[PDB]
């Protein structure tokens, strides 16, 4: 999920926006 | 783009910014 991808790991702006 | 972790309120702030459209 968003926490695993963006907080535990590093996510791109593209990956973050897919959670909108 | 930052090569930075986004957690907690920083993740919240980034989500509101990137999901916004006027």
From Swiss-Prot, chain A:
Disulfides per UniProt: 6-11
Name the record gives this protein: Insulin A chain
Species assigned in the record: Homo sapiens
Gene name tied to this protein: INS
Residue window of the full protein shown: 90 to 109 of 110
């Amino acid at each position: 999920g968003i926490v695993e991808q963006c907080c535990h790991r590093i996510c791109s702006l593209y990956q973050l926006e897919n959670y909108c | 783009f930052v090569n930075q972790h986004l957690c907690g309120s920083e993740l919240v702030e980034a989500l509101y910014l990137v999901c916004y459209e006027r």
